[PDB]
Design an enzyme around this catalytic site. Structure first.
Site, PDB file in Angstrom:
ATOM      1  N   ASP A 162       0.728  -1.053   0.059  1.00 41.98           N
ATOM      2  CA  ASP A 162       0.093   0.016   0.032  1.00 41.98           C
ATOM      3  C   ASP A 162       0.888   1.327   0.023  1.00 41.98           C
ATOM      4  OD1 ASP A 162      -1.882   2.066   0.252  1.00 41.98           O
ATOM      5  OD2 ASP A 162      -2.352   1.473   2.371  1.00 41.98           O
ATOM      6  N   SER A 173      -0.248  15.630 -12.198  1.00 45.89           N
ATOM      7  CA  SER A 173      -0.706  15.295 -13.178  1.00 45.89           C
ATOM      8  C   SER A 173      -0.722  16.572 -14.196  1.00 45.89           C
ATOM      9  CB  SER A 173      -1.734  14.207 -13.359  1.00 45.89           C
ATOM     10  OG  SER A 173      -2.119  14.161 -14.949  1.00 45.89           O
TER      11      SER A 173
END
Length: 330
Positions: free
Chosen positions: A35, A199
């Site tokens: 994770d 992004s």
């Protein structure tokens, strides 16, 4: 040193991935959910409340000659999906794909919430976010990667998750045969303890690319792709019959649909998520309403590049003094 381990989807939807991990002496092998959005290595154990164990493999520290109670240490964690677990702490030897850390904090669950009990395939979590998020008190503990870093050939790990197929976690090296083209690296902020990056934009299907900064986290422990409501609406508007359902808890679409791809930007590079990766199947057995793999982050407070996005790429988690993320197509 290096390590290399295969990671395997837990079910036919790629809801999560499990990777075998050796703990203790002699080894006890547990299948853990790696994770990158949390920083605790915790396991079902001989100390877990018996009614909360339902098929998981347990770690029994009393059977490990290298286990030592970390005196006074406790842990307690709550995840973005509302699940939680807590317990006490041992140190022990932990190996992943041939890479061994001695003295790793292994957090032994005394209690787990129902969603953990109900998932017999996940024996615990291995956190790979920054150690500043680790919940052990009163002495915060380091992640497996943080403990291994100095010994690794290169201070990196990579995630290469498969679509409906096994993939690989590598530690300490970048497998240049595992991706196509070049790896584009992008800046990371560690201020929230996550692999947080920005992004450069998105496209829906064959549509034109929209240049827009989207801050979010690379999170292997989250199944879906969570993005701003504007972006998610633009995606689902291209699917006839798709709608946001308050009763179901997100966007659903007709199971008869063919989904468009979704592209996200990494610097000047582009990662394309095929439409099929965005299909999470019937909302309930036999339903013709299917659950979407791109959902709004509006209620989260952070955008999350979960497995739906990450499995379309070869992803480098670069733990150099200034961390960065790398993405390549594959």
């Amino acid at each position: 040193s290096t390590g290399s381990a295969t990671t395997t989807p837990i079910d036919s939807l790629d809801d999560a991935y499990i990777t075998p991990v050796q703990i203790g002496t002699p080894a006890q092998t547990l299948n853990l959910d790696f994770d990158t959005g949390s920083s605790d290595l915790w396991v079902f154990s001989s100390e877990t409340t018996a009614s909360e164990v339902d098929g998981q493999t347990i770690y029994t520290p009393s059977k490990s000659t290298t286990a030592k109670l970390l005196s006074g240490a406790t842990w307690s964690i709550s995840y973005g999906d509302g699940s939680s677990s807590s317990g006490d702490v041992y140190t022990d030897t932990v190996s992943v794909g041939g890479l061994t850390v001695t003295g790793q904090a292994v957090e032994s669950a005394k209690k787990v919430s129902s969603s953990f009990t109900e998932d017999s395939t996940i024996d615990g979590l291995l956190g790979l976010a920054f150690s500043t998020l680790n919940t052990v008190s009163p002495t915060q503990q380091k992640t497996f990667f943080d403990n291994a870093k100095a010994s690794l050939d290169s201070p990196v790990f990579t995630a290469d998750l498969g679509y409906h197929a096994p993939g690989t976690y590598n530690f300490g090296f970048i497998d240049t045969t595992a991706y196509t083209g070049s790896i584009t690296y992008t800046a990371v902020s560690t201020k929230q303890g996550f692999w947080e990056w920005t992004s450069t934009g998105y496209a829906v299907g064959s549509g034109t690319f929209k240049s827009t900064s989207i801050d979010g986290i690379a999170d292997t422990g989250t199944t879906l792709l969570y993005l701003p409501a504007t972006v998610v609406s633009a995606y689902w508007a291209q699917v006839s019959g798709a709608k946001s359902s308050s009763s179901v808890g997100g966007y659903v679409f007709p199971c008869s649909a063919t989904l468009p791809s979704f592209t996200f930007g990494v610097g000047s590079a582009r990662i394309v998520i095929p439409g099929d990766y965005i299909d999470f199947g019937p909302i309930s057995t036999g339903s013709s309403s299917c659950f979407g793999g791109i959902q709004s982050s509006a209620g989260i407070g952070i955008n999350i590049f979960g497995d739906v996005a990450l499995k379309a790429a070869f992803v480098v988690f670069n733990g150099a003094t200034t961390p960065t993320l790398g993405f390549a197509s594959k």
